Design a protein around this ligand. Structure first.
Ligand SMILES: Cc1cc2nc3c(=O)[nH]c(=O)nc-3n(C[C@H](O)[C@H](O)[C@H](O)COP(=O)(O)O)c2cc1C
Ligand SMILES: Cc1cc2nc3c(=O)[nH]c(=O)nc-3n(C[C@H](O)[C@H](O)[C@H](O)COP(=O)(O)O)c2cc1C
Ligand SMILES: COC(=O)c1cccc2cc(CCCCc3c(C(=O)O)[nH]c(=O)[nH]c3=O)ccc12
Ligand SMILES: COC(=O)c1cccc2cc(CCCCc3c(C(=O)O)[nH]c(=O)[nH]c3=O)ccc12
Ligand SMILES: C[As](C)(=O)[O-]
Ligand SMILES: C[As](C)(=O)[O-]
Ligand SMILES: C[As](C)(=O)[O-]
Ligand SMILES: C[As](C)(=O)[O-]
Lengths: 314, 314
């Protein structure tokens, strides 16, 4: 307890919290608001080479147990996020991650060669989003393990510097084994963020008898309380499988207790999506106070004392 | 006058509600208790050829948002559930489904060959569980589409009568498309039950810093409030893709409103797992009363007036 500062990836962080990609991070105003917050770090909205308007509205809805979204990758385009990283961000305040989600391997490769020099000069960190649009006859890249191994071979070659990868959840132990083995072929992959939204849920409103988002006939990715045990399982499964990488936890964090659980499961940073969208950036002071209170009550003075130390029975 | 009656698969059901396989259905006492309840049907515990003790305890835990289990297929063996179907079940009370979950294709074929004549004579209905290991280190059967196709070819040939399948949830539209395509190759697959538990979640208790079930280092399938939007998405995705089959909904039903949503999404029968494990069989009269109250408020007199009629935006 006392202070939550930590060191990772050759950067210093005041605390393990940050936003989850896509939440409060699309515009210059959003990035400045996350920088002014008490978060330890921030990450930009996943970007494409060109600006995109994204899907028709309504495209995000939240409820007491979490959220559903089909945003459609609305973003200001890579040139904007690169300019933010290279000219506007104040690195004295906290580290910045830039998320990129190009629609093809070649788009991703082209973005990463342009990011490399700014990464070298300013220390922006890459989070590569291994999620994708629906392509009939094909699964998202992180659910096609040979495709994933390609992206990553090309990005590693094009980029040449340490980066991390945002993963969808898996639900099968054979898939954890295969996915972690792919990631462990790439020494430049230094962190793994588990998880993106739980794909293609469906929220229906009983009174109106209607789905609640317009795109994809109401289907969208789930976040929030629905997904905490899924997120913890993925964090711990990759923590156990990838001893030479860091794991960042994302999914279902509304409280310092939920962050403590992610850290027990193995998380180094803890990302906040739905709860941050719903509460606003004040949440970061509350999460830090709540995490330090649980640490004090247990006698922990550092995150290292309990990271990955979830106990199993027998 | 409003009515919850259904007539499907050559049987008559007083109402759409039944247990989910595995809950309140392992012993003769459990089956007689389900038969005495107000449910419209019941299904037996997934069985294997030989009796199994299942995994060490604790292997099921529940919490306000749902449950986690790694039961390990504990069951009295096929001969016991076939005897209950042949000799003990009172068909004048309600229809019976028998769930089978052999650990290889050959074990499944051996069971269904022996079930067939009792299905024909007594009208017990088969639910084949495809959320079930085959070769260890490979995914569960229904996440391996080639294994799925083989199981269904082999069981269709061996059994020769209408049956249904219990599916795990999917999270990728390409997987909905592929999975429904595989099902639609089999005309004897007349119902599809969506969904089994969401696989390999991990619940951690913050005070003890421990996982809450003993098998698989705490990893287990999730049911209950966590999984309702996932369940609804799978029900509706298979309802849209399998127009010549029925869909039975399972996942996250605690109220008549949750059942109404399943039915809007396309469900015929509605199965209740976690909430029945937690509340007991009195839940069925509460779910019938709650569903009738929503139907009365909306002016609906039968389930067909709204099954599959979820509205999309635009
Ligand atoms: C409105 C919204 C937009 C998101 N956009 C992205 C994104 O651009 N890139 C990405 O990696 N994940 C994105 N996500 C997923 C979140 O980063 C996060 O993985 C997910 O919401 C689970 O965390 P939570 O339970 O805290 O919400 C988005 C989530 C939401 C709710
Ligand atoms: C204790 C337990 C045992 C289960 N055993 C089986 C089983 O034998 N066969 C099966 O198809 N599903 C089994 N399941 C899954 C349930 O049938 C159901 O698909 C899942 O719990 C989701 O429904 P719910 O949200 O109502 O719990 C079991 C679930 C629980 C909680
Ligand atoms: C109906 O068409 C789409 O939804 C779509 C079209 C073209 C590109 C897409 C690209 C995506 C990629 C999603 C990547 C960003 C993201 C989003 C988001 O921007 O929707 N939401 C998340 O929960 N996680 C994410 O990682 C999703 C949908 C589309
Ligand atoms: C420790 O190793 C295991 O978990 C295991 C070992 C041998 C056979 C198994 C068989 C299963 C098969 C699951 C089939 C029944 C079932 C169960 C159950 O009995 O665990 N729970 C569910 O939520 N859904 C189900 O469909 C699961 C685990 C094992
Ligand atoms: C705060 As926004 C509307 O740019 O995510
Ligand atoms: C393990 As203790 C010293 O944190 O009470
Ligand atoms: C009620 As029981 C322990 O036979 O599922
Ligand atoms: C008219 As129909 C319920 O068989 O698709």
């Amino acid at each position: 307890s006392m202070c939550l500062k930590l060191n990772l990836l050759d950067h210093v962080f005041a605390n393990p919290f940050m936003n989850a990609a896509g939440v409060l991070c699309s515009t210059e105003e959003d990035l400045r608001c996350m920088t002014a917050s008490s978060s330890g770090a921030l990450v930009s909205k996943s970007c494409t080479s060109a600006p995109r308007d994204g899907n028709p509205e309504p495209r995000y809805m939240a409820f007491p147990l979490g959220s559903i979204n089909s945003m459609g990758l609305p973003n200001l385009g890579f040139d904007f996020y690169l300019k933010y990283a290279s000219d506007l961000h104040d690195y004295s305040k906290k580290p910045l991650f830039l998320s990129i989600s190009g629609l093809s391997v070649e788009e991703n490769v082209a973005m990463v060669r342009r990011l490399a020099p700014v990464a070298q000069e300013k220390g922006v960190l890459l989070e590569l989003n291994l999620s994708c649009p629906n392509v009939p006859g094909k699964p998202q890249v992180a659910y096609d393990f040979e495709a994933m191994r390609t992206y990553l071979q090309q990005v590693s070659l094009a980029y040449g510097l340490p980066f991390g990868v945002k993963m969808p959840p898996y639900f099968d132990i054979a898939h954890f084994d295969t996915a972690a083995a792919v990631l462990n072929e790439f020494p430049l992959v230094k962190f793994v963020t588990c998880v993106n939204s739980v794909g293609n849920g469906l929220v229906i409103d009983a009174e109106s008898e209607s789905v609640v988002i317009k795109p994809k006939q109401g289907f969208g990715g789930l976040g929030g309380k629905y997904i905490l045990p899924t997120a913890l399982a993925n964090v711990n499964a990759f923590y156990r499988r990838c001893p030479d990488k860091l794991v960042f936890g994302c999914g279902g964090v509304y409280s310092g207790e939920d962050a403590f659980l992610h850290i027990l499961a193995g998380a180094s940073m803890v990302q906040v999506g739905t709860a941050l969208q719903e509460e606003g950036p004040g949440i970061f002071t509350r999460l830090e106070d709540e995490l330090l209170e649980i640490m004090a009550r247990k006698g922990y003075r550092t995150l290292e004392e309990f990271r990955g130390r979830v106990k199993t029975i027998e």
